[PDB]
Design a protein around this ligand. Structure first.
Ligand SMILES: CS(=O)(=O)c1ccc(-c2cnc(NCc3cccc4c3CCO4)n3cnnc23)cc1
Length: 350
């Protein structure tokens, strides 16, 4: 990778999220979203390293802080949609063409730390909150499918979550140091999803009744010793990090144990590998994989970008000194975008 461009956003506030749109066809505009302060900004990637500003959403609340964003598409028209959330704990669905707010979801009792769309169902949106729970929403019928948390759920703020390849299971992590598994391919969850598609408040006077899931399908506190702020599936394996200068590759149970055979009482974990680095000992720093899960990227607190080939390389620029909070690869992995604490955006091309 070579650094081809850089720009600064006028708000001069930290940028906490960056996401390229992976739902666009080949030869169509290369677009990414950045989130920081009360703003959501769209950019187009052109030839010769040109970054063109498309649109900006400025929230009506000046005190709102966006912490996360996720792309989806309307199942009926295949048109892109963008979900954003932060400190207010309100989910907002944006139309990227008009950059106007379509609908909004209220429910979480505190800030939203991450949003993730289901890999097979574009209508299924997952949120992770400071209130200690995870929520599953159906954005087509505007229903809360389930709440993941309670008695045997997270005991402190949830910082990250990820669906597996097919969206049969979720792995969540947080300030309680634990990594918790939640199966969504159970009869209870499959039926709750099916029923959320049959709901309409116009044909009934009774509300939709969400599943209150109190118990996870696996739980460990043996991987990290501080806040677990990023988690991602890599096949049946897990990649997770704390603020202890390492990304750990692990799996529940023993070496030969199948993930779908793991019982909720499983006391063992297997460490498979460790991705070691420096100067990334602060809270709230994400790692990211490309679409094909062939590349891994992580920014550090002094502006350096680490890139590993999963099949280390350091990327540095003398004008890049601020913490890189998140990174995003373009669908084809030809471009890598980095966002910083000083409101700066950095473009690296292969
Ligand atoms: C520069 S400063 O003023 O000291 C500062 C720094 C960080 C935050 C902050 C950021 N992000 C989140 N949540 C999303 C999140 C969660 C896990 C990993 C992760 C992210 C975003 C990147 O990596 N926050 C929740 N409460 N505070 C925050 C606020 C102020």
């Amino acid at each position: 990778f070579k650094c081809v461009n850089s720009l600064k956003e006028d708000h001069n506030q930290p940028l906490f999220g960056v996401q390229f749109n992976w739902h666009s066809k080949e030869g169509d505009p290369l677009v990414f979203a950045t989130v920081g302060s009360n703003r959501v900004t769209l950019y187009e990637c052109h030839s010769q390293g040109e970054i063109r500003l498309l649109q900006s959403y400025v929230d009506a609340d000046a005190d709102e802080n966006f912490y996360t964003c996720a792309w989806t598409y309307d199942s009926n028209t295949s048109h892109p949609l963008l979900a954003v959330a932060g400190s207010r704990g309100i989910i907002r669905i944006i139309n990227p063409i008009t950059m106007q707010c379509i609908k909004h979801y209220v429910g979480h009792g505190n800030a939203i730390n991450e949003l993730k769309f289901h890999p097979r169902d574009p209508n299924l949106l997952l949120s992770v909150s400071k209130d200690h729970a995870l929520r599953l929403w159906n954005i087509q019928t505007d229903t809360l499918v389930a709440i993941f948390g309670g008695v045997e759920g997270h005991r402190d703020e949830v910082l990250s979550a990820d669906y597996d390849l097919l969206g049969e299971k979720i792995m969540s992590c947080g300030m309680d140091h634990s990594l918790k598994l939640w199966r969504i391919n159970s009869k209870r969850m499959m039926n709750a999803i099916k029923e959320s598609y049959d709901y309409n408040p116009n044909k009934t006077n009774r509300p939709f009744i969400s599943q209150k899931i109190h118990f996870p399908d696996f739980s460990t506190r043996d991987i990290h010793r501080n806040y677990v702020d990023c988690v991602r599936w890599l096949g049946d394996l897990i990649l997770s990090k704390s603020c202890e200068n390492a990304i750990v590759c692990w799996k529940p149970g023993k070496m030969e144990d199948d993930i779908d055979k793991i019982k909720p009482s499983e006391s063992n974990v297997t460490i498979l590998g460790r991705f070691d680095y420096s100067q990334c000992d602060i809270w709230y720093m994400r790692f990211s994989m490309d679409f094909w899960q062939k590349m891994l990227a992580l920014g550090n607190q002094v502006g350096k970008l680490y890139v590993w080939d999963l099949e280390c390389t350091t990327l540095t620029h003398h004008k890049c000194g601020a913490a890189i909070r998140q990174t995003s690869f373009s669908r084809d992995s030809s471009i890598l975008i980095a966002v910083c604490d000083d409101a700066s955006i950095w473009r690296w091309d292969r």
